[model samples]
Target: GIDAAQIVDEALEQGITLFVVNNRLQYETSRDSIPTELLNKWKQHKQELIDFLNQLDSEEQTKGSGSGSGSGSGSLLKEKRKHFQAEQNSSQEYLRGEI
Candidate 1:
């Protein structure tokens, strides 16, 4: 289980202004069977990201906060748009199949 407290600590340290901690452990366990190794890896990765986010200042964090939220239908759409933009930017180099 990914302890919410630990992640909250990291977020505090990293200057994270806002974040939602969804303790979905019970739901996750009931909804699906995930491999132990995979689950552990996911937790670790999530923790790492939280740690990184925590390094920013509150004001800096707020700058990117409006783009993500938990309410309304627009939230998911905005998230997907951001995700696709990120993927496109990351894949730019490979578009031409250059070494």
Candidate 2:
């Protein structure tokens, strides 16, 4: 649902790199057609998200890796990169619970 997109953006702006979005599959498998404008907006916003994450990845590799004693910001980045997938999993579980 597009409502999910709105919540996702709010989460992002709140320094929320950790998200539990509850609707990716719905978007992919919707029986109802998405309005062209909404789909276009989703695409543009998704590209922005991708680019933002890429920059974060690069910074983790170069800058953040040295920011602490653990020196494993790369791993942290990898872990965080799974945020979307984790959200997917959680969302699936939630939907099942609803049923």
Candidate 3:
């Protein structure tokens, strides 16, 4: 099932606050309230997000079970963070797609 609030919460957790703010602006626009299509898209991608998270969880578990030092996992996590930060910064434009 699709939970809009949960998606938004995940976005927040990703540090995509600019994206959130953009969505809120659209939501507040009397003529352009939040789009059902967008919500549906989010729902559609929900499983994809879940799978990605699950992969990350598995990676973490594997790391925990092994030697705990590397440029490997840490670099992955750092790159992931940088990716989202880039997204958030580039997404501040008011009229765009997913943030």
| Candidate number achieving the greatest lDDT relative to the actual structure | 3
For candidate 1, write residues 1-99 as lDDT tens digits: 555445444434443333322311111122223434443543555554344444442436444323322664555778788877765444332111000
lDDT of each: 0.38, 0.38, 0.42
Residue 62 error, candidate 3, Å: 8.9
Tens digit of per-residue lDDT, candidate 3, span 9-67: 55444433212221121122223334564556654665554444445446555431122
Q: Which segments of candidate 1 are over 4 A away from where they belong?
A: 1-43, 57-61, 68-99
- Evaluate residue 83 in candidate 1 and report its C-alpha lDDT on the 0 to 100 scale: 75
lDDT of 2 by residue, 1-99 (tens): 235346345544432322222211113222333344544554555645444444555555543212212442465767777874655443332211100
Q: What is candidate 3's local distance difference test score?
A: 0.42
Q: Indicate the residue-level lDDT of 23 in model 3.
A: 16
Candidate numbers, best lDDT first, in rank order: 3, 1, 2
- lDDT score for residue 24 of model 3: 24
Q: Give all TM-scores, in the order shown.
A: 0.24, 0.26, 0.26
Candidate 1: Cα lDDT at 14: 40
